[PDB]
Amino acid sequence: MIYLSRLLIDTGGNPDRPRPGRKWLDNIYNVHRRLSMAFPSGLRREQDPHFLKPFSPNDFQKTPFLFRVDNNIDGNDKRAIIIVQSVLEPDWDYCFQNALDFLAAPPETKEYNPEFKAGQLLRFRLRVNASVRRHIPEMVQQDGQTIETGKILHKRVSLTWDASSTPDQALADWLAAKSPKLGFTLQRCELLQLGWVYGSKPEPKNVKVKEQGQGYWREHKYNPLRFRAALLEGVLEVDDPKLFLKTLSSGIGKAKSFGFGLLSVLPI
Amino acid sequence: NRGTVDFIASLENLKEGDLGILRKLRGARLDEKLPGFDLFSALWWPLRQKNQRAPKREVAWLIAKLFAEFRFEQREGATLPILMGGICRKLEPKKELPRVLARFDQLASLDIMQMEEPLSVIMGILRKHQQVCLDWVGLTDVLSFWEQEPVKREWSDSFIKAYKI
Amino acid sequence: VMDHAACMVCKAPATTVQHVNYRRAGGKEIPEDLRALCRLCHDACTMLEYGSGMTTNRIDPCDPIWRERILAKRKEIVEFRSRGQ
Amino acid sequence: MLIEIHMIQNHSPANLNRDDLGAPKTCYFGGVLRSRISSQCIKRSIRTSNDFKALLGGVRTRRLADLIQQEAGETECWKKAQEILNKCGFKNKDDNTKMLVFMSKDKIKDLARIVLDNSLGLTEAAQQVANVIAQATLAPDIALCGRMLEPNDKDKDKKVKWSNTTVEAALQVAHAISTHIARPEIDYFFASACFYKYFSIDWEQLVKNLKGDTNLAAHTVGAFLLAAAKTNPSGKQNSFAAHNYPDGILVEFKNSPISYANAFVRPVSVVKESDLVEQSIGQLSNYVNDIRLGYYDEQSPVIGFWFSPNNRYPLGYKHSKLASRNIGNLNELVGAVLDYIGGFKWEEVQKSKAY
Amino acid sequence: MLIEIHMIQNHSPANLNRDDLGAPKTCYFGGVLRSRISSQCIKRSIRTSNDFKALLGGVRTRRLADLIQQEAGETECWKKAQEILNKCGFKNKDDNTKMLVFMSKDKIKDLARIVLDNSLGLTEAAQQVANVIAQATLAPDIALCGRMLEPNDKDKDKKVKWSNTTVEAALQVAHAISTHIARPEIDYFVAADDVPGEDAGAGHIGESMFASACFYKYFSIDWEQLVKNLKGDTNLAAHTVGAFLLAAAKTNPSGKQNSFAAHNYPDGILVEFKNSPISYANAFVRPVSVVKESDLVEQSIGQLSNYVNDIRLGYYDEQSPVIGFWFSPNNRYPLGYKHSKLASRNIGNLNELVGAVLDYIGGFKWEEVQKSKAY
Amino acid sequence: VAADDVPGEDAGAGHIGESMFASACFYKYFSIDWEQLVKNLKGDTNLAAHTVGAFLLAAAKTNPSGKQNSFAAHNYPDGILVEFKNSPISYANAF
Amino acid sequence: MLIEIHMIQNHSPANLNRDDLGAPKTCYFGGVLRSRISSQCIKRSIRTSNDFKALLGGVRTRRLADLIQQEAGETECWKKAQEILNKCGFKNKDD
Ligand SMILES: [Zn+2]
């Protein structure tokens, strides 16, 4: 019981007119917020029928979901798609009823109920996060001297593959290291895109307190976010089919709310 | 009144494409035909930022549309009542003069929002006699304070002074 | 902060704030009648206010009325505004 | 007069050239969607190659003051040097100079000589660096691509009057397009693609830009042809092995430049997906024949050379000849091009190098 | 009698004509967007072409004093030349004329002679300059493009009369519009940095534009007006007609050809000799939509053949017949498969088409008229 | 723009400006009174018939001569309705 | 008996009729903007056409003295002619 939805984002076509779709896709945090906005529980749907209200994050269901933004070529054109997998029914009607300029085509919701056993060859294509935690973290490197401010800063930083090692093989063995826990096997994994994605979160702070109440003289700070990204496809061999359903319903990665994690599997 | 001078000078600096854009919008609102809204916003907004004073939005819009339709060289000392009196003096004193004077005196009864056509007939009579100048700055300044009684008093008095000589 | 840095109409990230209920401006500013907006929705609302009438009151988002005209202005802004200005 | 190269060759898309969203570059031709390799990607992949490193003279830098750090006496090649250019025409904006300067690598030292001293004061050293920046034209790839450089005169303190700092391009590169429809990859609810590349080089303009250096021009033409033949057009900075040689190469000596992209307006559709390039060859062949019987001129005949590996694919009308040769080697093809151009040979022109 | 040229062309992805912002020029025809190449661009491409080099006898310039000084050797006369061009009613603005002047090159030396004589007063010299400028119009350049010169009145000295300056045009180039719905495309580009830095990428970031289309072109040459404009010369008129046909058949606009190189050739040409000028652009009111069997070019050729046959059978006249030549490269695309041969001759090579054009115009031989030239 | 034919130090243009244009499908309407034309032509009928025929042929095959040296829109009409009736009617209310 | 012509004609991008500024002539019909060719322009295009060459008899001119002298062929009548034109009710102004 997995809803495999699909979006057809309306990008630009003239870099002299406003193109809100590309600007929206430029920031991953706004993409995540807009995708999460499609889940009104019982209050935002019935009280306001036109989404003309101030935004309240507590008014939306905290339903876990995965999404990957990518591109495809069907028969005569190139389309930017956002494949979204979720366990609750997505309310795309409530999401773009005011911002229909964002979307080029009406969305789709097709049920995905796979009954997959082991030992059958299947093909896949997923985008994954490529961060590791260094048990020996390098110091702060204060740029005036580039030695140290503190000593230890345990940080998710980057997956580094030696000096002359190939990146695709390194990513393949890194995935195959955790593959027995998940329950598949790789033979011809390949790397297509390897880069970074960027975002910015508000994360409000406080500066001054009111003359008669709480610290409502507060303003908005801004915390940037960076993510190392890999996109990889190939074929996987199914083992222990109980676990593969959990991996399909959960996703492989550490940034499942920022694109990485969704795995799309097709039969041979 | 330097803001009005800058507004009129920017109006004279306009090319022919946006002049045609404004010409096509005669008698219209400001909420349709987006190029007109963008051009008017580009014309009027920098005045408020630097200069503390600025002409009213309705007055500026009316002046821009009238300038687009009735392009006249801005010249100091060519106020509308004086030219109207000079035209009225060289008229038949029995039939044409009461009609044209009634069309002129209709103007000092309405608000800014309804002066377009009663001003356009006046500019048409001016263009009929081949005028080449009009004081847009003085007309804008008078139209700004159109609710003050001495303003209308001086308007009528200037017309009568130009008519009599 | 209070509208969570989002537009009221198109729910895009906010850019500025529209000053509805222009009464008590400058010295008695209460951060309640103000409403956060993006650049396109604010430009559309200013287009609607410049046209028609204009008094001390303004055009307030979250109203079920004026939504269709705001969306039409959004369409016109998207398909007609030239950045070369 | 002009040397034009029409080649077809199969590549592996989705890892060659992308846009800001990561999508592979595609275009519309003949009403149908085709894969596209951009021209500037090609014009750089020749430059940063193992066959163009023999000359590779010229840097399109942005941090020119930092380039004087790597050739500096003790420390004088800093802010004093930076504000010499900053006052001249290039606002630094945190030592970035806010502009791209295309200028030859083997001219920094004299530039350092301009700034290492202290005899000159304000704006005279600026004129001294400006004239030597304008003069720095001798470069085998600057002459190929050309340069436009307009300094900002808002911050210029006058008396820095320039010469004509503009180089005409001697090379014209089209956009590579696929001879068939774009490959539809698997869509949820390892296929190569042929490509037609077209290049044109003006011999007279190339000679004039290098101020009568036909030996260096011939070396540039040969190195350019080799680099275009056996390099991967990308920016991935990896996988340098020439795993896919150019299957078809036709070189033509013409006065009026022509593009044979109209041979593939109708897509070369085959369900076999194996002999596709061969069929593509036939299509191109037919169009060339039509051209030589459509726009035939007697006072200006054309002469060409054809190459396929091991002479596997003929070019002409099955048996009737179209190109004067059936060369089955890259080096022999470059030798024929060289001796038809100027009676030269690859051994003679290899000794003249920029670097 | 007229000479009418209708062309079908196909273009590889390029940007041959841009506006003040960079986007390719477009238009609307039948309610759908179409890519457009302006008529002035096509006329400049023909006039500044290699095949039209032998007849480039006119110059449209603002820097007339530079040419006057180049004609002579003495420097100081240039100064006086500007003053001679000032009382003539032309004005100055940072050491050039305020308005462009179009004139034949071959007479410019006579202009210099007017400045070379120090015995002539300024008013009389200005009047002589006005006379030689107004009369110097015999060149194939202006012949087809015409001229319209308006001397300044607020600056001109008195007693400087002006003769007739307007030249009636003999060319009626239409705008070039595609035969289908246009598909403009963006192109993201960066500028890489050759020296490593602390950060990544650097350089410049931009988004250019390009489009590909199949176009329809129109040219119309009034034979009598061209002959009258050239003061009765027929050999020069035939040479101009042949050079124009060869240039417009084999030239492209030079817009962004260093990065797109769309040097394609036309693949269908219709040359007609009628008494009233007609346009077959109404064939493409319905846009050409490609299908799986045919391609884009042959579909446009079929629609053009349909419209041409319908027009010929509809607006037929008995006292005035038409004679048409149809050219395709080696008969790659015949003028329609269904209808009759709508051409007195079907030609597979361009040189025979030009020869037959000269034959029908006046029976002129090719090499006979190549001796007649202006520059 | 108006390119300058002479090279210089700045590579500028002689002139910069704009023009406007539009393509369109037009409806045109002519009406002729036969009796009034015959009365105006002093009882002549052959000249009146010549006038009607030449008017039809000219209005079906002639275009305005405004900016045709740059646009050249010599398009023939793709439909003509010729009516004979006792009162003048115009079908411009269709569109 | 009235004879009427109704024509539908397509037109590729052009500027057939202009105004003071240079914009193509427009008009409002049915609440929307249209493209307009003035009836005076159509009448003039019909009148001075090739199919109406054999019928162009009249002339509308302010230079009747020049036509009178051209039909006469002698000089000194011309000035006298304008004096005659000053007595019939045609006051001359600048030749
Ligand atoms: Zn908004």
Please tell me the number of Cα atoms within 13 Å of E98 on its side-chain side. Answer: 16
CB G93, CB G82: distance < 8 Å? no
CA C60 to chain centroid, in Å, comes to 7
DSSP calls for D42-74 = HHHHHHSSTTTTTT---EEES-HHHHTTSS-SS
Partnered with residue E207 across adjacent β-strands are E188
Chain B residues touching F18 at Cβ < 8 A: 15-17
Site from A25, A26, A47, A51 to mutate, C interface, most C CB atoms within 10 angstroms:
A51
Using DSSP, state whether A57 is helix, strand or coil: helix
CB F20, CB G22: distance < 8 Å? yes
Q: What is the CA angle A182-A185-A191, rounded to 5?
A: 100
What phi, psi does C63 have (nearest 5°)? -75, 130
Structure tokens given for A124: 């896949």
Could you tell me what percentage of chain D is helix, strand and coil, using 3-state DSSP and rounding each to the nearest 5? Answer: 35, 15, 50
Strand order in the sheet with F22-33: F22-33, G2-14, F80-85
H or E element in which residue E38 lies: none
CB F84, CB G2: distance < 8 Å? yes
Burial letters for B102-140: b for 16+ Cβ neighbours within 10 Å, e otherwise?
A: eebeebeeeebeebbeebbebbebbeeeebeebbbbbbb
Which subunits count as partners of chain B given 3+ CB pairs below 8 Å? C, F, G
What phi, psi does C71 have (nearest 5°)? -70, -35
Distance A47 CA to ligand 1 centre (A): 21
Using DSSP, state whether D177 is helix, strand or coil: strand
- Across D140-289, the runs of DSSP E, i.e. the strands, are 147-148, 166-167, 171-173, 176-177, 193-202, 248-254
Place of tokens 């290098």: D210
Distance E147 CA to ligand 1 centre (A): 53
What phi, psi does E234 have (nearest 5°)? -100, -35
Chain E residues touching D172 at Cβ < 8 A: 257-259, 261
Phi-psi domain of A196 (left: phi exceeds 0; alpha: psi -120 through 50; beta: other): beta
Binding-site annotation: residue ranges of C for Zn(2+): 10, 38, 41
Chain F residues touching G58 at Cβ < 8 A: none
| CA distance linking residue C20 with residue C43, whole number of Å | 14
Q: Which amino acid is at E364?
A: F
| CA distance linking residue E335 with residue E327, whole number of Å | 9
- Pairing type for strands D59-61 and D101-103 reads antiparallel
Q: Determine the straight-line distance between the first and last CA of chain F, rounded to whole angstroms.
A: 38
Q: For residue E6, give the nearest of E289, E371, E278, E191 by alpha carbon.
A: E278
What phi, psi does D330 have (nearest 5°)? -70, -50
What is the dihedral angle through the alpha carbons of A157, A163, A169, A173, rounded to the nearest 10 degrees? -50
Using DSSP, state whether G67 is helix, strand or coil: helix
Structure tokens given for D349: 């022109």
Give the number of other CB atoms < 10 A from CB of residue B43.
19
Using DSSP, state whether E66 is helix, strand or coil: helix
Binding-site annotation: residue ranges of C for Mg(2+): 10, 38, 41
- Test E330 with D293 for CB contact under 8 angstroms: yes
Residue count (chain E): 375
Phi-psi domain of E136 (left: phi exceeds 0; alpha: psi -120 through 50; beta: other): beta
Distance F35 CA to ligand 1 centre (A): 67
What was the experiment behind these coordinates? cryo-EM
Query: Resolution of the coordinates in A?
Result: 3.4
Could you tell me if C71 lies within 8 Å of chain B, comparing CB atoms? no
Chain F meets chain A (3+ C-beta pairs below 8 A) = no
Chain D residues touching A193 at Cβ < 8 A: 22
- Pairing type for strands C34-37 and C16-19 reads antiparallel
| CA distance linking residue B79 with residue B109, whole number of Å | 19
Chain D meets chain C (3+ C-beta pairs below 8 A) = no
| CA distance linking residue D24 with residue D30, whole number of Å | 19
Q: For residue A54, give the nearest of C75, C37, C40, C21 by alpha carbon.
A: C37
Burial letters for G67-94: b for 16+ Cβ neighbours within 10 Å, e otherwise?
A: ebbeeeeeeeeeeebbeeeeeeeeeeee
Chain G residues touching B23 at Cβ < 8 A: 21, 23
| CA distance linking residue D92 with residue D154, whole number of Å | 13
CB F55, CB F34: distance < 8 Å? no
- Test E184 with A13 for CB contact under 8 angstroms: yes
- Across chain D, the runs of DSSP E, i.e. the strands, are 2-11, 26-29, 32-37, 59-61, 101-103, 147-148, 166-167, 171-173, 176-177, 193-202, 248-254, 303-307
Structure tokens given for E138: 């015999």
Distance B164 CA to ligand 1 centre (A): 60
What phi, psi does D42 have (nearest 5°)? -70, -45
Could you tell me if B94 lies within 8 Å of chain F, comparing CB atoms? no
- Across chain A, the runs of DSSP E, i.e. the strands, are 2-9, 65-73, 78-86, 108-112, 121-129, 184-186, 190-201, 223-238, 263-267
CB A112, CB A223: distance < 8 Å? no
Alpha carbon of G16: minimum distance to chain F alpha carbons (Å):
5
Which subunits count as partners of chain F given 3+ CB pairs below 8 Å? B, E, G
| CA distance linking residue D8 with residue D17, whole number of Å | 18
